[PDB]
Design an enzyme around this catalytic site. Structure first.
Site, PDB file in Angstrom:
ATOM      1  N   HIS A  44      29.538  24.726-102.987  1.00  0.00           N
ATOM      2  CA  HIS A  44      29.165  25.633-102.108  1.00  0.00           C
ATOM      3  C   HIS A  44      29.064  27.151-102.591  1.00  0.00           C
ATOM      4  O   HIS A  44      29.858  27.992-102.096  1.00  0.00           O
ATOM      5  CB  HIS A  44      29.959  25.735-100.675  1.00  0.00           C
ATOM      6  N   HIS A  86      22.662  30.285 -96.142  1.00  0.00           N
ATOM      7  CA  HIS A  86      23.130  29.370 -95.061  1.00  0.00           C
ATOM      8  C   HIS A  86      24.622  28.969 -95.441  1.00  0.00           C
ATOM      9  O   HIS A  86      25.178  28.290 -94.477  1.00  0.00           O
ATOM     10  CB  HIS A  86      22.326  28.026 -95.250  1.00  0.00           C
ATOM     11  N   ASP A  87      25.205  29.177 -96.515  1.00  0.00           N
ATOM     12  CA  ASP A  87      26.589  28.895 -96.794  1.00  0.00           C
ATOM     13  C   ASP A  87      27.286  30.138 -97.255  1.00  0.00           C
ATOM     14  O   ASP A  87      28.293  30.056 -97.881  1.00  0.00           O
ATOM     15  CB  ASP A  87      26.811  27.759 -97.945  1.00  0.00           C
ATOM     16  N   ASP A 115      19.459  21.058 -97.504  1.00  0.00           N
ATOM     17  CA  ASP A 115      20.817  21.365 -97.794  1.00  0.00           C
ATOM     18  C   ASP A 115      21.227  20.078 -98.790  1.00  0.00           C
ATOM     19  O   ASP A 115      21.979  20.301 -99.423  1.00  0.00           O
ATOM     20  CB  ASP A 115      21.587  21.256 -96.698  1.00  0.00           C
ATOM     21  N   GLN A 131      28.699   6.787-102.133  1.00  0.00           N
ATOM     22  CA  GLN A 131      27.431   7.340-102.143  1.00  0.00           C
ATOM     23  C   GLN A 131      26.481   6.303-101.539  1.00  0.00           C
ATOM     24  O   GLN A 131      25.587   6.988-100.920  1.00  0.00           O
ATOM     25  CB  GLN A 131      27.029   7.494-103.812  1.00  0.00           C
TER      26      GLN A 131
HETATM   27  C1  LIG Z   1      24.469  15.759-101.555  1.00  0.00           C
HETATM   28  C2  LIG Z   1      25.616  15.438-100.538  1.00  0.00           C
HETATM   29  N1  LIG Z   1      25.841  16.091 -99.658  1.00  0.00           N
HETATM   30  N2  LIG Z   1      26.958  15.699 -98.871  1.00  0.00           N
HETATM   31  C3  LIG Z   1      27.814  16.310 -97.771  1.00  0.00           C
HETATM   32  C4  LIG Z   1      27.530  14.338 -99.497  1.00  0.00           C
HETATM   33  C5  LIG Z   1      28.356  13.567 -99.000  1.00  0.00           C
HETATM   34  O1  LIG Z   1      28.823  13.761 -97.972  1.00  0.00           O
HETATM   35  N3  LIG Z   1      28.740  12.460 -99.844  1.00  0.00           N
HETATM   36  C6  LIG Z   1      29.706  11.390 -99.581  1.00  0.00           C
HETATM   37  C7  LIG Z   1      29.744  11.057 -98.163  1.00  0.00           C
HETATM   38  C8  LIG Z   1      30.735   9.912 -98.150  1.00  0.00           C
HETATM   39  N4  LIG Z   1      31.475   9.290 -99.000  1.00  0.00           N
HETATM   40  C9  LIG Z   1      32.357   8.386 -98.981  1.00  0.00           C
HETATM   41  C10 LIG Z   1      32.993   8.310-100.345  1.00  0.00           C
HETATM   42  C11 LIG Z   1      34.030   7.821-101.056  1.00  0.00           C
HETATM   43  C12 LIG Z   1      34.318   8.178-102.391  1.00  0.00           C
HETATM   44  C13 LIG Z   1      35.322   7.149-103.064  1.00  0.00           C
HETATM   45  C14 LIG Z   1      36.221   6.449-102.463  1.00  0.00           C
HETATM   46  C15 LIG Z   1      35.816   5.998-101.150  1.00  0.00           C
HETATM   47  C16 LIG Z   1      34.626   6.671-100.478  1.00  0.00           C
HETATM   48  N5  LIG Z   1      32.398   9.341-101.302  1.00  0.00           N
HETATM   49  C17 LIG Z   1      31.322   9.951-100.327  1.00  0.00           C
HETATM   50  N6  LIG Z   1      30.409  11.057-100.590  1.00  0.00           N
HETATM   51  C18 LIG Z   1      26.500  14.238-100.527  1.00  0.00           C
HETATM   52 BR1  LIG Z   1      26.333  12.979-101.963  1.00  0.00          BR
HETATM   53 MG   LIG Z   2      27.063  24.613 -94.957  1.00  0.00          MG
HETATM   54 ZN   LIG Z   3      24.724  24.030 -97.755  1.00  0.00          ZN
END
Ligand SMILES: Cc1nn(C)c(C(=O)Nc2ccn3cc(-c4ccccc4)nc3n2)c1Br
Ligand SMILES: [Mg+2]
Ligand SMILES: [Zn+2]
Length: 314
Positions: free
Chosen positions: A69, A107-108, A218, A270
């Site tokens: 960020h 925005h951040d 975003d 992911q």
């Molecule tokens: C671009 C972007 N902007 N955001 C807010 C994201 C995000 O929120 N990404 C996320 C969501 C849910 N997740 C669950 C796990 C995870 C990992 C290891 C073990 C178990 C679960 N990793 C995750 N990553 C991404 Br891409």
């Molecule tokens: Mg933000």
């Molecule tokens: Zn952002």
């Protein structure tokens, strides 16, 4: 009379029009890249350049040195919105186009690398001043502040009521980056489009479509070529894991996304995210704005690259 354009080198001048453009690792070019985008999106006459430059540089200064960020994120998100506005020339007022590139770069503001969740469990003073969308009301607060510093009023040639419209588009645009708000917003837009009642003359409807645009810009890391997407993942998790570290210090088990001891689950985490948020996001956006189809295509390419990570083919 301002015969003073910004021009970029050939490769950038060509790549910057594409949705998957990466702004590069040369920080000092990012201000020229933003001004370039305002000028082509909005016109040379939109903003007094002395004021615009001073504003950009105060925004830069109020982003912190966190892994994700950060100022590079700000400029990345603003490039996505430029690309959306450029492939949808006729659909946006002069004021929305001014406001939305600014909303994206602000925005951040003054983000510390922690979710709204962690501010509430830490009991941070900002969680008392602002009960929901905590960090987002703060980012908008920081934007009013910088706008009100001497020499920094880039809207100084708007009337009283035009000025109040732009600050209200910037506010709604920044609030909408609260991903907790996106799920409801997208379902609504989904129905409005499918029962045929979506109307771009209805201000409440416009407001939902900008909201969606803000979520898409975003999240635009998931729309880059795979090597960018993958390297930006490391930075995202470096915040998420530091946040889990802080959760553990308060005596709370973080969710696995924030637990560095669960790095193994990342490829499956992911997929969840691509299916539960990204694909739905860029789907509904393509339906409302058909020229954004290249965000959905890129996103489906990176979902397919993450399935290949799981099947041990990378
Ligand atoms: C671009 C972007 N902007 N955001 C807010 C994201 C995000 O929120 N990404 C996320 C969501 C849910 N997740 C669950 C796990 C995870 C990992 C290891 C073990 C178990 C679960 N990793 C995750 N990553 C991404 Br891409
Ligand atoms: Mg933000
Ligand atoms: Zn952002």
């Amino acid at each position: 009379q301002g015969l003073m354009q910004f021009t970029l080198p050939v490769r950038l001048c060509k790549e910057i029009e594409l949705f998957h453009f990466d702004i590069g690792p040369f920080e000092n070019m990012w201000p020229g890249i933003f001004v370039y985008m305002v000028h082509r999106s909005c016109g040379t006459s939109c903003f007094e350049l002395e004021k615009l430059c001073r504003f950009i540089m105060s925004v830069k200064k109020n982003y912190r040195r966190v892994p994700y960020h950060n100022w590079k994120h700000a400029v990345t998100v603003a490039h996505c919105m430029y690309a959306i506005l450029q492939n949808n020339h006729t659909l946006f007022t002069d004021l929305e186009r001014k406001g939305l590139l600014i909303a994206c770069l602000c925005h951040d503001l003054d983000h510390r690398g922690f979710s709204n969740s962690y501010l509430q469990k830490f009991d941070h003073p900002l969680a008392a001043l602002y009960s929901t969308s905590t960090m987002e009301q703060h980012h908008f607060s920081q934007t009013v502040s910088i706008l009100q510093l001497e020499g920094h009023n880039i809207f100084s040639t708007l009337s009283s009521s035009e000025y109040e419209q732009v600050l209200e588009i910037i506010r709604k645009a920044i609030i909408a980056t609260d991903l907790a708000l996106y799920f409801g917003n997208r379902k609504q837009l989904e129905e409005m489009y499918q029962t045929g009642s979506l109307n771009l003359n209805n201000q409440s409807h416009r407001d939902r479509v900008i909201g969606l645009m803000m979520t898409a810009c975003d999240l635009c890391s998931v729309t880059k070529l795979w090597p960018v997407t993958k390297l930006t993942a490391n930075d995202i998790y470096a915040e998420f894991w530091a946040e889990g570290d802080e959760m553990k210090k308060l005596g709370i088990q973080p969710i696995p996304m924030m637990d560095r001891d669960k790095k193994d689950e990342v490829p499956q985490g992911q997929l969840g995210f691509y299916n539960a948020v990204a694909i739905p996001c860029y789907t509904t956006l393509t339906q409302i704005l058909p020229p954004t189809e290249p965000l959905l295509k890129a996103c489906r390419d990176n979902l397919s690259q993450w399935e290949k990570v799981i099947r041990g083919e990378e």
